[PDB]
């Protein structure tokens, strides 16, 4: 990038002009060009909002660092009716939005559905009750 | 025996229906009318589109 | 292309038997403003009766889901 020593050399040169230049016999530096892998997948199935139009979605870099931030940012959710085995009745409509990779575990699934949350809290209060 | 069934009766019912799960669901097969409505739209749109 | 359709205003008007509620021939008037207007969905949206039925179906199917 033409070292300022070259500016001093070509512009107003002292009788003694001393420059330092890196020695490369054949030049031709490496091309670099990292390997990127674009991934397309169906995420946030049945969202609650219109979400985003195409061509505005882009491709978002992902890694182990932002993964949970990519879930929480993308807000993947699921809403469906399921038979209620707890107290007869019929289909139970549940709405779940997973904000972390741990939210697919059955514990977090139980904590997100409000009824199963009340039952799970009941169990933690009784099991915590049997021990002092 | 049946005493635990009464405890999970009161707990399961009280927790389940007290606030959340509004109106729940009973018979959702009433939405099969959409099958008949759609069927009528196929019967009509077939004639509209297939006309000379 | 779509500006050539919308500019040219291709249309179709004819009587067709009404299968929805007995009766007889149903006169429909349709003018296609886009290449998507030949699809059966847009055909249903343009005829006013089929528009009311299609809106009924979207309100019920949208009703069964929250």
Q: Which DSSP string do the residues of A8-38 spell out, in sequence order?
A: HHHHS--SS--------SS------------
Residues of C in Cβ contact (< 8 Å) with A95 = 66
Q: Report which DSSP code applies to A65.
A: T
CA distance A125 to B14: 15
| 3-class state of residue A57 by DSSP | coil
Whole-angstrom Cα distance, residue C58 to residue C66?
13
Solving technique:
cryo-EM
**Residue B24 burial by CB count (10 A; 0-12/13-18/19+): exposed, middle or buried?**
middle
- Give the Å distances, CA to CA, from C7 to A57, C2, C33, C42: 33, 8, 8, 18
The answer to whether the CB of C25 falls within 8 A of the CB of B44 is: no
Residue B21 burial (CB count, 10 A): 19
Out of B33, B41, B51, name the one closest to residue C44 (CB): B41
The helix or strand, by DSSP H or E, that contains position A93, with its residue range, turns out to be strand A91-97
- Residues 6 or more apart in contact with residue A22 via CB below 8 angstroms: none
Q: Which candidate, A120, C37, C64, places its Cα nearest to that of B48?
A: C37
Total residue length of chain B: 52
Can you read off the two tokens belonging to residue A77? 């959710």
Resolution in A: 3.3
Nearest residue to A67 via CA among A51, A92, A43, A33: A43
d(Cα A64, Cα A79) in Å, to the nearest integer? 28
Among the partner residues B15, B19, B21, nearest to A92 by beta-carbon distance: B21
Q: Are C33 and C43 in contact (CB under 8 A)?
A: no
| A80 beta partners | A94
b vs e for A37-67, b when ≥16 Cβ sit within 10 Å of the residue's Cβ?
eeeeeeebeebeeeeeeeeeeeeeeeeeeee
The three-class DSSP label of residue B24 is coil
> Chain A to chain B, count of Cβ pairs less than 8 Å apart?
45
Nearest to C58 by CA among B31, A77, A121, A94: B31
Structure tokens at C20: 């929805």
Residues of chain B whose beta carbon is less than 8 angstroms from a beta carbon of chain A are 9, 11-13, 15-21, 24-28
- Distance between CA atoms of residues C45 and C34, nearest Å: 13
CB C6 within 8 A of CB B30: no
Closest Cα in chain A, distance from residue B26 (Å): 5
Give the pairing type, strands C11-17 and C25-31: antiparallel
CA atoms of A25 and A14, how far apart (whole Å) = 28
Give the gap in angstroms from C-alpha C65 to the nearest C-alpha of chain A: 8
A33 burial type by CB count under 10 A (0-12 exposed, 13-18 middle, 19+ buried): exposed
Q: How far is A82 from chain B (nearest CA, A)?
A: 10
Neighbouring C-beta atoms of residue A99, cutoff 10 Å:
17
> Do the beta carbons of residue A95 and residue A115 sit within 8 Å?
no
d(CA C60, CA A21): 77
Measured distance CA(A95)–CA(A106) in Å, rounded: 15
Structure tokens at A72: 């929480």
* CA–CA gap between residue A130 and residue A47 (Å, rounded): 42
Torsion of CA B42, B46, B48, C2, to 10 degrees: 90
At residue C12, φ and ψ (nearest 5 deg) are -145, 135
């Amino acid at each position: 990038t033409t070292s300022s020593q070259k500016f001093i050399a070509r512009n107003r040169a002292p009788r003694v002009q001393i420059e330092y230049d890196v020695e490369l016999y054949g030049a031709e530096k490496k091309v670099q060009l990292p390997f990127v892998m674009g991934v397309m997948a169906d995420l946030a199935g049945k969202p609650a909002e219109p979400q985003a139009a195409v061509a505005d979605r882009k491709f978002l870099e992902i890694d182990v660092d932002n993964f949970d931030a990519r879930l929480k940012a993308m807000k993947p959710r699921v809403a469906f009716n399921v038979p209620n085995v707890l107290t007869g009745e019929g289909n139970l409509s549940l709405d779940i939005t997973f904000e972390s990779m741990d939210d697919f575990s059955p514990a977090a699934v139980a904590r997100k559905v409000d009824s199963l949350n009340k039952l799970l809290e009941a169990r933690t209060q009784l099991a915590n009750l049997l021990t002092y | 025996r049946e005493a635990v069934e009464t405890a999970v009766r009161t707990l399961a019912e009280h927790a389940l229906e007290q606030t959340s799960l509004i109106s729940n669901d009973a018979i959702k097969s009433i939405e099969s009318i959409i099958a008949a409505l759609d069927a009528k739209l196929t019967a009509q749109v077939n004639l509209i589109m297939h006309h000379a």
